[PDB]
Design a binder for this molecule. Structure first.
Ligand SMILES: OC[C@H]1O[C@@H](O[C@H]2[C@H](O)[C@@H](O)[C@H](O)O[C@@H]2CO)[C@H](O)[C@@H](O)[C@@H]1O
Ligand SMILES: *[C@@H]1O[C@H](CO)[C@@H](O)[C@H](O)[C@H]1NC(C)=O
Length: 434
């Protein structure tokens, strides 16, 4: 797709810290850009929509190639249309914003410049950030993660994509998302199936896969840390159901692991660690600091800080595994106790190390789940399972919670705030910022 300028594209600024082993942290200046799927897509020579509701213009978009040549992406009014605002080192995203249209959530990327994505090499480093999840009830997910996206949004590989990173193109993740309107410089109109439960989305014949590091997926009830390997580290297109993931009939038929080696404290047995109120170790009605460390062995460590007190990831006992570190032993034990083979089939942490050794793009979003109502995160799932089944209970939300239409009308004012992002070698982000 190309880019049009009926609406100016001004990326909201966002500062973060880059720290060194020497003990100092220096301020960096970046900005955020909203994903292409959220933008107005119209004809290059007029205001005629190429996509409206959940269907494509059959004349402007008779196929993927022609559609890409005839259509462009436009600018976004971040605050008034998407409810996305920043202030210094802080970023806030509102759940539902009502303007000339109704908007739900947003997916944003951190930029190095006005035309490129900031890449982060996680291996050997740690990532810290503060978060306020107090306004996120059951069914919502304020996410912060990394994906192996190209820094230019794909422009160099796909010449027909001239909008690039400036317009948020090139997304990919371990679900090999088929809901993307533009993949590899082409539209996704061929094989498009509108959603039976969502008036603004659909499923195309193509998906976009790549490694994904889910550092933070949570609401005020539950939180999870999950690495997802793919046999092909970087962004790569897939065909229909061969994609696997959430948008396909066969979830495990693709090249990526849609489940991952997840770590949710509640699911592991500690139901008193994270929750709303002073009865939990970490009170989700108050802001907290989350630190994630990627050691060279390929294992992942985690600690939290709230009101000056530090808490390491709680100890978990799963099979012959005991500890608080996400490593090969934990992931093997989880597959044994909870079931599954997706993570190990895709190479596990060894294959995942290939992704963290390379560049990854930072993504921040707020979303509701039209496929599983976020039950996999904060409730009992599958809903037919009981508490006797190992790993079924992931949170205290009712199995009837998370219906999109319901949460959108009952909690329109929900929101999430990410702030004070710090990155640098292991053991350095706790030092004085600059
Ligand atoms: O596809 C939705 C959601 O799935 C998450 O994986 C679940 C999986 O769906 C479930 O069958 C299994 O029992 O548990 C895993 C871990 O919670 C996946 O981690 C999410 O990224 C994804 O959005
Ligand atoms: C949960 O984790 C916290 C912090 O590690 C710990 O203090 C508490 O005792 C744990 N509770 C249970 C029931 O395991």
């Amino acid at each position: 797709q190309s880019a049009c300028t009926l609406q100016s594209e001004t990326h909201p600024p966002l500062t973060w810290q880059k720290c060194s082993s020497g003990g100092t942290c220096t301020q960096q200046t970046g900005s955020v850009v909203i994903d292409a799927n959220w933008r107005w897509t119209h004809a290059t020579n007029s205001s005629t929509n190429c996509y409206d509701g959940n269907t494509w213009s059959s004349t402007l978009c008779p196929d993927n190639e022609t559609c890409a040549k005839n259509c462009c992406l436009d600018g976004a009014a971040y605050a008034s249309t998407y409810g996305v605002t920043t202030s210094g080192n802080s970023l806030s995203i509102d759940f539902v914003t009502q303007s000339a249209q109704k908007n739900v959530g947003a997916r944003l990327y951190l930029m190095a410049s006005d035309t490129t994505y900031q890449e982060f090499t996680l291996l050997g480093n740690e990532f810290s950030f503060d978060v306020d999840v107090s306004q996120l009830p059951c069914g919502l997910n304020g996410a912060l993660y990394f994906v192996s996206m190209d820094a230019d949004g794909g422009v160099s590989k796909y010449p027909t994509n001239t909008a690039g990173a400036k317009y948020g193109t090139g997304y990919c993740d371990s679900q090999c998302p088929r809901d993307l309107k533009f993949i590899n410089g082409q539209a996704n109109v061929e094989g498009w199936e509108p959603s039976s439960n969502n008036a603004n989305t659909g499923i195309g014949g193509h998906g976009s896969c790549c490694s994904q590091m889910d550092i933070w997926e949570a609401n005020s009830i539950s939180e999870a840390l999950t690495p997802h390997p793919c046999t092909t580290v970087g962004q790569e297109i897939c065909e229909g159901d061969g994609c696997g993931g959430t948008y396909s009939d066969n979830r495990y038929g693709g090249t990526c692991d849609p489940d991952g080696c997840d770590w949710n404290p509640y699911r592991l047995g500690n139901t008193s660690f994270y929750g709303p109120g002073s009865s939990f170790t970490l009170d989700t009605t108050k802001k907290l600091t989350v630190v994630t460390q990627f050691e060279t062995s390929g294992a992942i460590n985690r600690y939290y800080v709230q009101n000056g007190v530090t808490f390491q990831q709680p100890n978990a006992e799963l099979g012959s595994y005991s500890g608080n570190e996400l490593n090969d032993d934990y992931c093997t034990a989880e597959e044994a106790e909870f079931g599954g083979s997706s993570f190990s089939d895709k190479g596990g942490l060894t294959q995942f190390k290939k992704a963290t050794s390379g560049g990854m793009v930072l993504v921040m979003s707020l979303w509701d789940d039209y496929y599983a109502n976020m039950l996999w995160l904060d409730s009992t799932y599958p809903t037919n399972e009981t508490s006797s089944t190992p790993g079924a209970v992931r949170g205290s939300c009712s199995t009837s919670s998370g219906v999109p239409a319901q949460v959108e009308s009952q909690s329109p004012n929900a929101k999430v705030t990410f702030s004070n992002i710090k990155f640098g070698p292991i053991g350095s982000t706790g030092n004085p910022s600059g």
